[PDB]
Enzyme design. Sequence first.
Site, PDB file in Angstrom:
ATOM      1  N   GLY A 186       0.788  -1.233   0.000  1.00 13.86           N
ATOM      2  CA  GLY A 186       0.000   0.000   0.000  1.00 13.86           C
ATOM      3  C   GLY A 186       0.817   1.279   0.000  1.00 13.86           C
ATOM      4  N   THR A 187       0.119   2.411  -0.071  1.00 17.00           N
ATOM      5  CA  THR A 187       0.765   3.726  -0.091  1.00 17.00           C
ATOM      6  C   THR A 187       1.329   4.061   1.286  1.00 17.00           C
ATOM      7  OG1 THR A 187      -1.232   5.024   0.464  1.00 17.00           O
ATOM      8  CG2 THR A 187      -0.846   4.548  -1.876  1.00 17.00           C
ATOM      9  N   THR A 188       2.195   5.069   1.338  1.00 15.34           N
ATOM     10  CA  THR A 188       2.861   5.449   2.582  1.00 15.34           C
ATOM     11  C   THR A 188       1.944   6.300   3.465  1.00 15.34           C
ATOM     12  OG1 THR A 188       4.936   5.537   1.309  1.00 15.34           O
ATOM     13  CG2 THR A 188       4.999   6.362   3.580  1.00 15.34           C
ATOM     14  N   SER A 247      -2.456   2.085   5.912  1.00 15.72           N
ATOM     15  CA  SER A 247      -1.897   1.669   4.630  1.00 15.72           C
ATOM     16  C   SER A 247      -2.269   0.217   4.369  1.00 15.72           C
ATOM     17  CB  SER A 247      -0.375   1.799   4.645  1.00 15.72           C
ATOM     18  OG  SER A 247       0.022   3.150   4.812  1.00 15.72           O
TER      19      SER A 247
END
Lengths: 231, 240, 244, 250, 243, 241, 235, 111, 195
Positions: free
Chosen positions: E29-31, E74
Amino acid sequence: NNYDGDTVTFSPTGRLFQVEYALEAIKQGSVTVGLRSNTHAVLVALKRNADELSSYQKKIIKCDEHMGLSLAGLAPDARVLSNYLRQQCNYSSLVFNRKLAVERAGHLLCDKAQKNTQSYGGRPYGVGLLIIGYDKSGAHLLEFQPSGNVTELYGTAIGARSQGAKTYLERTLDTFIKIDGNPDELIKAGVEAISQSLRDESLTVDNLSIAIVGKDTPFTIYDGEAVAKYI
Amino acid sequence: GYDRALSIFSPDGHIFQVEYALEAVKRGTCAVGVKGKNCVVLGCERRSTLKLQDTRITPSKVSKIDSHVVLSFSGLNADSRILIEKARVEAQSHRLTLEDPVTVEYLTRYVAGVQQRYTQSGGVRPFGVSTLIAGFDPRDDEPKLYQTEPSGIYSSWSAQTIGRNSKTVREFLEKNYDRKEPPATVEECVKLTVRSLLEVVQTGAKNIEITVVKPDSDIVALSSEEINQYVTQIEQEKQE
Amino acid sequence: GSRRYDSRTTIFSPEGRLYQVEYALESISHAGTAIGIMASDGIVLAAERKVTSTLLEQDTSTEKLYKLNDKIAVAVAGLTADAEILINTARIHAQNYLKTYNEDIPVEILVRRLSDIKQGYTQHGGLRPFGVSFIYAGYDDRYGYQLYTSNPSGNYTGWKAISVGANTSAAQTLLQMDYKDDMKVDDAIELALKTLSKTTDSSALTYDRLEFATIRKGANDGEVYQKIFKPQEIKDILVKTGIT
Amino acid sequence: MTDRYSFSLTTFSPSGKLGQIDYALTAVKQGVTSLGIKATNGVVIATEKKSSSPLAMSETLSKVSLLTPDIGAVYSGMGPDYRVLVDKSRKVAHTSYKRIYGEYPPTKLLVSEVAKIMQEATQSGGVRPFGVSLLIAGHDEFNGFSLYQVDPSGSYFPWKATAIGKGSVAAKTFLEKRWNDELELEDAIHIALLTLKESVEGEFNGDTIELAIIGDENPDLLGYTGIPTDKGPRFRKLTSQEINDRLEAL
Amino acid sequence: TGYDLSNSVFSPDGRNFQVEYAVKAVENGTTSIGIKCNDGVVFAVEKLITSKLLVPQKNVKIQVVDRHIGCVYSGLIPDGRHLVNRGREEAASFKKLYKTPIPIPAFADRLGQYVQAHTLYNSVRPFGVSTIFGGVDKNGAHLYMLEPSGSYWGYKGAATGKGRQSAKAELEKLVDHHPEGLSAREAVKQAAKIIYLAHEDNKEKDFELEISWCSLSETNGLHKFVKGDLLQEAIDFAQKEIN
Amino acid sequence: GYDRHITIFSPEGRLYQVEYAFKATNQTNINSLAVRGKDCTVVISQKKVPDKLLDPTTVSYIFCISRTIGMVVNGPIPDARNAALRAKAEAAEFRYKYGYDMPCDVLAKRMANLSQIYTQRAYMRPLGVILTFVSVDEELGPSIYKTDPAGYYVGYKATATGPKQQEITTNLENHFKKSKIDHINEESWEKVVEFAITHMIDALGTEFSKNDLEVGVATKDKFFTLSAENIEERLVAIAEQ
Amino acid sequence: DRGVSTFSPEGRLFQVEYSLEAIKLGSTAIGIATKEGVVLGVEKRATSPLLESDSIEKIVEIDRHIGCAMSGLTADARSMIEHARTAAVTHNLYYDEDINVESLTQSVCDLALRFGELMSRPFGVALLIAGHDADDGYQLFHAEPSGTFYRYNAKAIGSGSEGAQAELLNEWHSSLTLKEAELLVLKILKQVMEEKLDENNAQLSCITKQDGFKIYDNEKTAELIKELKEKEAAE
Amino acid sequence: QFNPYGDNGGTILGIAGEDFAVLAGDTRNITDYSINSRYEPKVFDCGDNIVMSANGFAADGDALVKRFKNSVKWYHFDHNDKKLSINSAARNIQHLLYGKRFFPYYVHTII
Amino acid sequence: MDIILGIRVQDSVILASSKAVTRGISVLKDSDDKTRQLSPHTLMSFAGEAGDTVQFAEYIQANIQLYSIREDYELSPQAVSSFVRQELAKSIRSRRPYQVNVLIGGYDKKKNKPELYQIDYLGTKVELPYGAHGYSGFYTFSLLDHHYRPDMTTEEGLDLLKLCVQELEKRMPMDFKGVIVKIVDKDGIRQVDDF
Ligand SMILES: [Cl-]
Ligand SMILES: [Mg+2]
């Protein structure tokens, strides 16, 4: 492979294959397009038939006077989810005398789809939805995926060959967003957008399905001779 | 509660559990139904590997559902009791609400519905039983003979057989039974039924059961000597 | 989920057989032989205890023969623990019938209900069947003396003489040979013991490896008496017939 | 969520074996030796206190447990399974008997209730069998003294004397030579200590041996006086000192 | 083997492979980050702009619980929402019974026990999110990070997602260089920088910055979103540092 | 081989899931120790905070179950907290139902019975933890009782748990061989904590700072944990002797 | 094994797709919609000559204005018909009117996907639901176990479906009379049927606004069969 | 003891012509001898050319109207925007009212 | 409902049951048969609360008929009476009890003896030579105490019954429109058409 028997199982790379297989059902579905300006929001849907003797599968469903969606994938699942939206929209009206915000509509669909991806026995929903609506914060367009992910957009498309319409809308973004106070022109842009996803077939009178909602326009669907204007 | 979907579709479009239940029916002792002009006769095989039996108390193969309708079967014996019990209860329940005994068609439709329910209910397997349901509707002299099977389909038959070697006795009945002229009397109908079982049974001693049902709740089971007389008569005519 | 670990106990084989019922019957075939013989004036129940140890308390023991009511008894072949679950149910059912109708329960009715319970475990619930086969010996005023057997399939049948458990094939042949319809109880007692004595896997049949019971009308005038034989009484009846 | 295991985890194999019961019995075989001997005027049950660590206080861990004032139990196999069975056995003696008849159950019937609980773990949904064999000694007015063995299957047998667990085969042979029908209680305690020394390897004293009897009534252990009919519990656990006294004249 | 096919099954190591597999979904996932400060906490997240067609500022990922707790996560976004929905139920019942708003440590365990409960059975799937959350209560500021296993600790700084190692390194420098403490307004600016620095591990698509904060002085102890002038100020600060 | 996935018997009478839960116990790589004084019961555990971004005050494996009972866990923190919350609820309910504070040994038995259920019932997995309960019981005095994933439990004169448990165990065994008694013959709890740390230092062979340890102390009518400075004060006392 | 409600990698429910194979094994059923009415016809297919063919009930009344024909595992259709009948009568009770043919079909199709781990498996039967209402006039619907329904001008289901559907494609026009439609069903049934078509092994029915739903007699169908043979020989 | 009913007074009147129909009602709302509102409407447009009033206990009247308006809405959803005929509306309302046969809506309803 | 009588004689049981069905100030029917055949040799008359009477009678009838089919055997009068008693004994502690009083007249074929059982709505069973429910008993019991003999014939029993009906028609306040009389013996159940 060994991790696609049910939705309760993760793969070694952290994937949910049953959710991905449900996502695959949407890609097989017929193309549908969504786009909006600041005054109106429009759904354009390519309907599909079994053969020349059959009718064309209805893609667009009304949820409330100010909200509705188009579907792509398993139609019965869309009926279940659209029904749930109708109830949630209706609960907001009866209890709070309040039109359900299009953003909350998305949040509710996300949470409903999610529960099906974490429990044994059940399955993910096998359909993708494009929700349009006009509420207290103007026009809206949502994209629902059965993974649970809901996304608010200016325009989008889902189904087979949806990438063609999605690219067109990505180019036309600056043009169609400012089509304010003009329904027929916003529809024309949507009809031109869905045309980029056509192969061998063209838009006929009992093939095309258009829906619109806006400032002084309740959610209404156009089929048959009513869409002949836009071909 | 135990929920498992035991009866399910296979790639080729078959419900194996329902089809395997039919194999249990094929294993069961032969049962035959023949309807005449004014009667129906239910014949039943009894395997002779069991001596030292007590025939007084041993469960009879033909069961009365009401005073005017009977039920015989082929397949799992224990399964058949459950169907018979439910049918008997529905028979009394019908009398209680409609103020009229069940028709043979209705009783068959109920039993067949129960069998069907057990093919798409979770946690249960289908009944390994096919039934022959025979009788006469209230105030009616037209003979009725119906068949059911594990899947839940049912239908009416001029004559029919089920169980092991049933395909042999069905072959016999198909050429020997005339639609234009069914067995005019009780004797003729019983004889044709006994004849058909003698193609399969072995000996005509304590291996064949015969039950005759006539209009207006007139049901009687034949004894050994009575059946043996048909066996003796048929064999003497055969040597020709 | 849990589907992975489900044995599916209540399904059909491709041949149309119930796997678990068949395997339960295979279990019962290793259990100590039990024989029931019905005479004109009574019923005999004989059963062989499973390989006895010399330090086993014999007199205050009950493994094979159980009392259901004053008129009905059973011989067990299989898992004792399973049999006791079914026996208590049967005992209760008999008392329910007596409470409702003020009459002792007819033998067949009790047998049918117990057999229906076993049937259920083969059709629904996803549980293993009871690894038990009964010989029911009882009396009522409709059919008189009756012998029945039931097995894990929930199927029951009536008999003049019958065996369950181990070596039934050999035992049934011997019973079929010497049995006749005008037989008395004392003759049936002798037949039961002689059959066990020949079919036994043991070296010699002794009092300590047997349970025995009779159901006679040998009480005083038109009434039935159940006799569960004591160790010393089995010792005497074994000498009297000349087996030891 | 929820217990989805509504199906049997113990089933019949093609050969007719009930796998989990067999395997439970294998677990019992691994367990420490325990035994029971019946005398004319009493019963003795005994076992070795296998200490997990010398820092552990073996007094706190009780392998021999009182079920009723006249009934005691000991085991071989898995201790935790035994502990919960003792809890359930004590409760069932009240709920299914004492609260109904106003008196404690006879040995055979309490044994029967414990057997029922173990049988259900052999057939019910989503459970394994208990991994223990129990020896239950007890007394009641109409049956006198009695000794029973209860196996994972739920089967139970009455014994004059027997042993279960690690060295049961050798121990049973030893008991066959020594047992007679005229044994007094003290003689049975003596034989119990002799039999147990064969199976025990390390230390053999009152601190490593747990032993209890079902004998005469103990008015001193009752806790009150004034009711003539109430004469005290027949179950008594022998103290560490009382065992060592008999080990000198061994 | 087969020990990794079912949730709640111990491997011979003593590990629950299904939970470790859920961690992989989180790493994908994204930060997202969390910074504890003088009198509160600051939360920030990377929003990948998949297309021009995404409406800016209108796909909000940071969520509020009660009125004083902020949550960000995330991994599988829907799983994170489910966890927050539960958090809101837990916080509501606490306030209902005990009157006072739920303390952060109390709230942390409520999520912890719930996530841990999803490692106890094979009929449920572990959560596919690591959740950074916290706020201000009677005992001051608290920052927490919760993982698929149900494991959580208190943090001075926290980070998770595809650029977690880049963010962690940058967070460790702030803890060293500011032992006396970091201010709320500073932490907002630093959060922006760290997201921009952590974006280097996800640099195909360009992104949209989103920040939120709780502070006893700046926001009066309540959770608010950073918007307008304060947001643009933090973006410009981050833009200056990458160049 | 599905007999290794759920809690059913293997052919050799073993429960592999229970055995693998025991191995999860050491996943944290932390050692714990418990000893008894005259008036008190002391428990100590290693504290390892590897990440610099962690708030060290929130990193703990010792729990205050009730006012009188304390509990240290050897195993992963999620399962540790699961067990702690349940133990707290059980101890509170006990007091409400039966009108007196739940004894240490009774709570141990209760938690052990719960652990036993997970070894028998299939849908529930065992918790990969070892629970060491400590108190000064009003009847039995200073008490140490320990629970494991098998559902086993027993009282202790003293005990240790963790990867290097055996080294600590024998270290304590040799002391009680020498002292000839069941406890630490000491008046104040301060010196019993000093004994515990001293003998852990000798057994493990490592030196400890104030932030490397975690200490719990049980006295009559209260159990409490020590702060960093309380431990530092205690470490100074050992060093100056 | 595997879950009952499991998706295949192509994005289809295994059990629903397998039930469609069961329907292909079923006997033929044909429906044709005209402005004068909707005709429904089926292949009876008796497994043996001793079986009394008039007891084979594969065409069924739901209400006076709605009829139904089936194909596949016909035992499964009983509960579907029961539900349809109850739905129709219940709507009349609540609203004092006939229920729309589409609304009825939708109600039946709601059962279809109510299976999983509700019933244990999908239905193994397809339905042709024909009827009339005041709004949309004469209508023919094809209800599947997927929960999907399509309106048709004409439709064939069962073993001879794909061959019969291609034939219906050529023959159907918007000006067909009822008599023309009756013969057309008989014609196409005779083509795809194994055994030779007659009044005993095939059954006709229709629904008109005036007379409602009617199953034809064996005497009436026999004359239409004789009329059909004469017309084909006439050119 | 708590009394769940009240009387809000007022009166209503409906007349039907050849090609029209009227439904009238006064706008006064009362409890006991006090006036609550001089203008509180109780005759509503419910859609599909159906006007409705439920006079008596206003709380029950508003609830019923609200439910019927909602019934009209769902009739459209479930039956392809079909117009609810006046006769069909009547029968629907019977069921609404009779559903509370053992705890009635204290109203005289006219459409 | 109201008047139901029963007399057991040497070889039979005779049940008399009033024909009137009254509601308010109107006799709605004057030919009502207040009895159900439970089995070929067992008859039950009934009287009590409107609706409850028939609903109960038919419920019992169904159950006894079900038993007969299942076992292919007729339950003894004693057994049927015990079953009926238990059903009423359950009923009385229900939410809404059956307010029905019954007489069960049967001929036991095994004993070759007639049997008459009187059971009230509480589940109070008694075997009697003669029985009555409601106000009837206040006249008939004393009358039968005097005139009844245990060895009477069926014809003598009918004359004894005529004497009861005459007394009731003379002294009862309500017009019960005569009685339907039925005889239960070794040959089953039959109705006397001219009474
Ligand atoms: Cl407990
Ligand atoms: Mg488990």
